[PDB]
């Protein structure tokens, strides 16, 4: 009984309405592309492995995992209706690294600058 990861969040779901949109577009080629390439994007870019990185309560203490990896192969697959369900993903992600850890860590430092690039980039999307 050694410790495992939760199954990922599904980004695939055929069952669930989706479009294609202008601000959907923008957000895979603009918003998540700009900030997969930045300095502190690496933890983010793949689910949280509480194996590898040896946090066991990890998934004891978020319940809704997410991370920009999923978001990418979401916005790929056109898995969302509209802009406000990935951005409350972005949001998801960002708060639930809040969450685990404080003020001051490093982990925080790298998500509080993401969000406010984020923030800064969804400013303004297409019409």
Same mark, same amino acid.
């Given at each position: 009984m050694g410790s495992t990861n939760p199954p990922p969040p599904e980004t695939s779901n055929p069952n669930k309405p989706k479009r294609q $949109?202008?601000?959907? +577009? /923008?957000? #895979?080629?603009?918003? #998540? %592309? $700009?900030?997969?390439?930045?300095? =502190?994007?690496?933890? =983010?870019? +793949?689910?949280?492995?509480?194996v590898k990185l040896? #946090?066991?309560?990890?998934?004891?203490?978020? %319940? $809704?995992?997410?991370?920009?990896? $999923?978001? %990418? %192969?979401? #916005?790929? *697959? *056109? /898995? /969302?209706w509209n802009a406000q369900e990935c951005i409350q993903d972005f949001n998801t992600m960002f708060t639930n690294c809040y969450i685990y850890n404080k003020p001051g860590d490093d982990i925080v430092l790298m998500a509080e600058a993401l969000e406010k690039l984020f923030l800064q980039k969804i400013n303004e999307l297409p019409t």
């Open positions: $949109t202008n601000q959907l +577009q /923008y957000l #895979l080629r603009v918003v #998540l %592309k $700009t900030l997969w390439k930045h300095q =502190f994007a690496w933890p =983010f870019q +793949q689910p949280v492995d509480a040896n #946090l066991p309560d990890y998934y004891k203490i978020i %319940k $809704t995992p997410m991370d920009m990896g $999923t978001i %990418k %192969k979401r #916005l790929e *697959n *056109n /898995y /969302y």
